[PDB]
Chain length 217, copies 2
């Protein structure tokens, strides 16, 4: 097993949202087998960002998911060779982000290369007016198809003054070598911003991610 | 007590799928506060149906959901006046159904009026070829907006041979008077066809439904 009980990672993010180019670099660590991690992000280009930080936070570490012994762990099995993923984020006011990731390993250090293209955020909307206050806890539905893992997740941003702003995640995770596939299952997650400077050009995040069966049956 | 701890209901369904008209009538009973119910359905017009029974099974009973004390029960509070809902079912092969419900109560019997319009089921697809083998248990994500309950569920039909046929549920539930709105939460469900005749003109189903918060602290 190339995945130690304690691990670090580096994330390199680049892309455009509503035509605004930026780069973010991150240093993370955690306990992959406990589904616990933390990351320090720096906006290295195009900060301060003109859009809500929250739209980037779930793009900056699926090896840090607690899997029980009876549910094959697609992502961890992929190492050392690693995996890629693609994701679409469909926001309820019509905006879309497309994201691609390539993940690899270097000693005790995962390396994530992530690219985002986001468009059609209304200038009106809570993303460009920064009215978001973090994501609700969520549950990804996962199942195996043609040797890839398909993920779906109904995510929701909390809005300044009470309501929610919805975002549908669709994810395709692809190991760079075939691995043992899981059955139909779920991952419960909780993602929080745990620190920031005033303009969110320096940010830290905590995540907890635990796989499980369906609760009923 | 508006809603008794042992209740019956009557379901009246009519609609069109790929232009085929049909009517279904049901007698149900269960324990609304324990999230347990059974129903006996008869296809009274247009039988035998030329499409998989499974696409109708989740359209014929949200009063029968076990809610814990701390999560407001939107649907039970709406009685005796009742509620309406609208649901879209979006299948991954481009098939779609739109559904509308109106519900009320009469003594110890709920009355459900449901109308469905479905189309675009391909002739060699699993619905028109009757290759489906029931729904996976699922989890509906619910939250409050402008006195209404918004629900989203990532559903999956099991197929002959072992894959899945995905369907996205989007639901809007509307109480007929103002009630105490719940916070963001989940309902887990398991729906089984427990008995049927060969052409599915007589069918019995069982359902379990339980509300909760996220599993993570």
């Amino acid at each position: 097993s190339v995945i130690a009980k304690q691990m670090t990672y580096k994330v390199y993010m680049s892309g455009t949202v509503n035509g605004h180019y930026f780069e973010v670099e991150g240093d993370g660590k955690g306990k992959p087998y406990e589904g616990e991690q933390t990351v320090k992000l720096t906006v290295t280009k195009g900060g301060p960002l003109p859009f809500a930080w929250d739209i980037l936070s779930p793009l900056m570490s699926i090896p840090f998911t607690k899997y029980p012994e009876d549910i094959p762990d697609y992502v961890k099995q992929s190492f050392p060779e690693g995996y890629t993923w693609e994701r679409t984020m469909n926001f309820e006011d019509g905006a879309v982000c497309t994201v691609s990731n390539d993940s690899s390993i270097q000693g005790n250090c995962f390396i994530y290369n992530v690219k985002i293209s986001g468009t059609n955020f209304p200038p009106n909307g809570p993303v460009m007016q920064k009215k978001t206050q973090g994501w609700e806890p969520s549950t990804e539905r996962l199942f195996a198809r043609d040797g890839m893992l398909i993920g779906n997740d109904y995510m929701a941003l909390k809005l300044e003054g009470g309501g929610h702003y919805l975002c549908e995640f669709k994810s395709t995770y692809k190991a760079k070598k075939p691995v043992r596939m899981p059955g139909y299952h779920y991952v419960d997650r909780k993602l929080d911003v745990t620190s920031h400077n005033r303009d969110y050009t320096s940010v830290e995040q905590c995540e907890i991610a635990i796989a499980r069966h369906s609760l009923l049956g």
